[PDB]
Symmetry: D2
Subunit: 379 residues, 4 copies
């Protein structure tokens, strides 16, 4: 009753704004605040922490419905929910939960997450942002690159190097910890918005820590287990991105069906040619196959959230790998069915193709997803 | 999930040892068909009230999938018998027809088969010319069916024949078909020689010849003139079974490949240690899971329709049949590569799984047909 | 290979020195590179395979194909600016023009002072090139053109246009009314002719693609190019040459993307090593280069068939072009997407050119005949 | 002329034996008898060693036309020519040339080549068959596996380990040497024919060396340079296999175009549907692109053998990679167009798909070809 339900909720919230968001690199604060007033920034979190008391699948559906019409809007929510609000709720203390989750789930605060560094993006373990103890404070130094929501975010999750310890075989190893960084923390700046191929309305900025001293109780999770917390967070985030890729491919298919039904070239609708029919049919099935992967991932996560001791990293990895590749594949072929008109800004299909490309890259590339799947498989 | 591990144990202990002989000798596995019947597996999702085992459609799907992991021949025998012969009788039969055929069919004493395809028109399933004529209290059948699964070993057949000669309101001449239950002991009915196929070679794929086949009046299944509608509703359920067959062939191919690359060594390391091997297996695994969810989703939409929920599952079946068949052919080809030269010989079963995977793209409606069904609903 | 390897270098140096430093500004600013076209004109690169007798540079068709390839390795916009100008405006004039029409337009087209363009596509039917409605009517000593063309490359900066208009309304063998077309040389200065709204496009954004408007466009009688009623056959013989140019543009985009990728993966590190030390990166590059090399041979072969036809050997090259256009365009889109993948997040930003190349590669599958058109050409010949 | 005419020769040889050669695992010895008398066993070899005096391209065309009808016949010629006769000519002394090349190019002697071992197939540098000096003789011991033509071959090229030396810095390494082995050499045995998925008429057997005492002069090439001789031999053979794959795909496309013109389902030919036309058109374009790669490599090796000093390993690697992947893809999509009739032995398409599978593996798998190509590219 929450799953079937919210799908219409999210379907009615629609996209008269997607063209200007993309064309003008414009962050949609109107949509974000409407979402806060609607509970869409706190969906699967319990009401005891400020959330809307929904389930993980309803969150996935919301992202997918938004991403059908604006990939940028889907990633703003997804990143804020899965990458900032989720690790607080999943590893934070009652005090940490109460101080941060009510304002994140209501929309009052926007959340971001910084792991990626210039030389340690895929090698997220070999990073160089550091954190040292100073009495009752921590002192951070370094930078984070390509951080979603960063220009408009109020709270940031930051992974920094806290200890340099030894491994079993004497090789020095770096241990990280997660830190809750507020936008007002001194010595913390947000750089300029990057110029991207797509999801342009999304604020992708650099983080700069120049002696950012934060209170001692901003440490999230177990000291030195920050890498494990980061990888656990990305597992939930990868379900979010997979649901984004799914909506882009679904939105692209939606528009293409409408277009081929009305345009006629040889005296008949373009939909009357067999090639058009087979392309749309094969694409739809591929999209359906990806939809169930995404849906299966979301509820395996729900199982883990409900106390069951199950792992969902593999399911999430499979979902993001297949959804992202399906999204790029569907958008390219759908643009083909538009002909020359699909190469212009009159229609959204060109934006959707640019937007689809990112889902294969960010929050862990497809290659990293295959490392996850094969690791479980070959073990 | 409890029935699934039963099937897995049965398929590995009782079916897998026989797959090589079944394929290499074009050997119908009469033995295991008797064993499965004793285990109630030829009637899985039919209720106990008609002689079934009282399972659900998915347990049947999981059984076909699990059998097909080790023997594509065994999987299709169960699938065709269940979805193409037993299902149409349960869906459109009279209480007399159900009580006579369903208990023996679900028990396994009688094997089932479906005749639709003819030589002149196989994809054009509405341009066929096998006929049934009124004669007193009997029907007279005449024609031929081609490529019939289980034909050489089936006791009861579902036969689609042209009965009425009508012409549509548009103006074009239209053939109306009817479905008929034909028993192997019928006069003027014979089964041809087994075809020589590329894969699923133990499956008995033969001709059906009707030369003045005289059958009773009460052998007509369903409404007169709707026989083609009966065939297309039967095929929708069958395509779910073929989808789970393709899924199982891909699943078993990957399983053997993962095993092989861990133990076989090259350049000093296991082949599993090379990044290209890991990514091929990873990508194939994700594609197989995507197909699996499609298959189970279709199986449950059909379960809804069987429980009273008036939904259609044609498109869900069409999607599952389409994706799972192309995944099977893709996976087995790439899995064979990871075997190297050893995968080209009969020592391993990868070459049989590749040959078995191709048929899933074709029979019970080609992938092109599946795209016709899907786009017809989408573009409506 | 030949001293054609000497001219191949010219296009590579020129692309790397004069064109490559401008590609980002061309794309980001939707900026027609008016400075490079003038440079290429002074270099005779807008007349490459036309003879000196008609004031070209006296090269071969293969040289022009490589010129487009080398330019499209760095800037797809610059590549298509030459390709349409050469293969879609100057080629039909040279192929079907009277000595006056040749002497008048070719000296300016091959020099660079005049830029060319081709109008076929209309809104109501672009793929269905037999159902258009731009009309041309006899009026005394002049022709009167009315209608519109859409998507025309170079339209906002071109001086002379090849326009296909419906002249003859004739009855066919089956009794249906068929429309016959004629080709006309329209100068930017003709009364009643206007280039119109440009297009904000996905890629090749520096290219000037605008609509053409004919509102009582009155042009001389001797502007007609070719025979009356056979303008459509002229347009399809023009497109056969142009599809070789776009196949080379696609080939170049795929080639330049691979060069950039191989450079990036050798210098960028992770997990202790260079990204080129991982097997997946190696097999991705190796397979793309093998596909690209196969597309090159198709493109190059279509060029030689075209040059065989020009040298008097009566041979058809429409299938060879369609094969080139189909495979090269699908290779470009595939290579650029997979190359961007190997860049990680850095490929999604404007810092590097791979995202521009991926956006540019998508057009080669579409303009001057979609890939579905190409397959129609190829299957028609095969099933005949 | 030698190109445009030998195409006519090769297109003409017609035997209706392909079906039973593959169905009965029957080596077509009469076909080899006929081809030897036509001079098809030494085509590109000069007349002063006993060849026909043809070019490398005609050999490629002979394999391509034979493989268009019977992939088994194409591989017998290719293996015998490119893997046994070629290294005799290219590395043998005039004494070795005079003794072996006339009978090989005339078809009296069938050639074979052994490099692959049970544990060193892709890792052809880590094998264990050895050869030691004994008076005026060598002694060979070990085993080779998967050796084409071995069941009916008279002369064999055997790679054996002759020296274990130290490399530049100090690791022990194994050096190999080539050896000409005759069928009548004592202690040399041929095993049973393997049961293969396809090219089943070809004699794929194991070689066993139990005190294979051969005269001292049967050493081929420079001592300790056997492995270098191996890869250079496989370079030529890879062009041959590429031709086979090209032939298989071409013959596949041929039968399919014929079949779709004649078969009617919906009141019109299956050629009349758009899906069929696009499938055939795209495959034709794919095949044509492979054909150029095969020919280009063939003429690069013709340059080689005319004295010009260029390497054709990369060209041969690209040719085999693309052709093998095009053959498999084409045969599968052509079987689809046959419908249920293509799954039976009535038509040759299913045998074609089984034959296409082999070209991706032997004489260097696609992964080995990508190792070669990326080696040159990344260097
Ligand atoms: C950047 C750009 C520059 C251009 N420059 C020029 C120029 O300089 N000159 C010029 O003349 N044109 C130009 N064009 C137009 C271009 O050639 C057309 O866009 C192209 O021919 C496709 O036609 P269309 O855009 O009208 O789409 P449509 O014709 O509407 O095609 C829509 C889709 O339907 C498919 N389709 C159509 N008919 C069939 C059929 N019978 N069977 C199956 N599928 C079918 C098409 O392949 C396509 O996928 C340009 C276009 C672009 C985008
Ligand atoms: C092993 C095996 C077992 C079988 N078992 C059974 C059984 O138990 N019962 C039964 O009834 N049948 C059975 N068949 C027959 C099978 O169902 C038919 O063969 C199949 O439905 C179509 O095959 P065909 O050759 O008749 O179709 P064809 O139409 O001859 O197919 C030729 C090709 O044309 C394509 N095509 C056809 N029409 C169109 C169109 N309008 N648009 C585009 N493409 C089109 C098809 O997709 C196919 O690629 C079996 C076949 C095999 C091989
Ligand atoms: C739009 C956008 C939003 C982003 N948002 C965020 C955010 O909110 N939070 C955050 O922390 N980061 C974010 N990032 C950064 C992002 O996480 C990284 O870009 C991504 O994870 C990969 O980082 P990279 O590009 O440095 O990796 P690189 O390692 O530079 O990737 C280059 C290529 O090498 C491959 N590769 C690397 N190692 C191997 C290997 N061992 N084997 C095979 N292939 C390998 C990769 O898969 C890729 O194909 C964002 C990036 C973008 C573009
Ligand atoms: C019909 C047939 C005929 C043959 N005829 C001959 C003949 O005449 N002469 C001869 O010498 N040989 C012959 N062979 C052997 C053939 O050359 C080998 O089968 C082939 O080279 C692969 O070696 P393998 O079979 O040991 O596979 P393996 O090396 O056991 O397989 C390794 C697999 O892993 C893949 N892979 C991916 N990454 C790597 C990596 N980093 N390192 C290693 N592998 C990797 C490989 O591509 C391959 O798929 C024949 C084989 C067959 C099937």
């Amino acid at each position: 009753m929450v799953q079937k339900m919210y799908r219409e909720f999210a379907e009615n919230e629609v996209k008269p704004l997607a063209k200007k968001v993309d064309a003008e690199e414009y962050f949609p604060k109107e949509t974000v605040e409407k979402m806060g007033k609607l509970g869409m920034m706190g969906i699967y979190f319990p009401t005891s922490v400020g959330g809307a008391g929904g389930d993980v699948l309803s969150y996935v559906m919301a992202v997918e419905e938004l991403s059908k019409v604006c990939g940028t809007t889907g990633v703003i929510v997804s990143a804020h929910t899965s990458l900032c609000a989720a690790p607080i709720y999943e590893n934070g203390t009652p005090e940490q939960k109460e101080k941060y989750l009510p304002k994140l789930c209501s929309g009052e605060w926007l959340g971001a997450f910084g792991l990626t560094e210039p030389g340690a993006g895929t090698d997220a373990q070999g990073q160089q942002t550091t954190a040292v103890e100073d009495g009752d404070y921590w002192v951070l130094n370094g930078s984070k690159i390509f951080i979603t929501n960063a220009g408009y975010a109020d709270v940031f999750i930051v992974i920094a190097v806290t200890d340099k310890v030894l491994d079993k075989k004497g090789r020095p190893t770096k241990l990280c910890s997660a830190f809750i960084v507020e936008r007002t923390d001194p010595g913390f700046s947000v750089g300029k918005a990057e110029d991207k191929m797509g999801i342009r309305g999304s604020s992708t900025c650099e983080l700069i820590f120049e002696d950012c001293r934060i209170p001692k109780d901003r440490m999230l999770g177990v000291r030195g287990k920050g890498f494990q917390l980061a990888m656990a967070t990305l597992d939930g985030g990868r379900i979010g991105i997979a649901s984004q890729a799914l909506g882009i491919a679904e939105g692209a298919l939606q528009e293409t069906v409408a277009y081929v039904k009305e345009r006629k070239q040889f005296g008949r609708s373009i939909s009357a040619f067999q090639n058009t029919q087979f392309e749309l049919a094969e694409m739809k099935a591929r999209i359906e196959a990806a939809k169930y992967l995404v849906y299966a991932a979301a509820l395996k996560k729900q199982e883990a959230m409900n106390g069951a001791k199950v792992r969902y990293s593999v399911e999430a990895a499979q979902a993001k790998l297949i959804a992202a590749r399906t999204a790029s594949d569907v958008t390219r072929r759908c643009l083909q069915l538009f002909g020359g008109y699909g190469y212009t800004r009159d229609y959204p299909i060109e934006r959707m193709m640019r937007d689809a490309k990112i889902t294969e890259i960010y929050e862990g590339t497809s290659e990293v997803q295959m490392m996850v799947i094969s690791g479980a498989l070959l073990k």
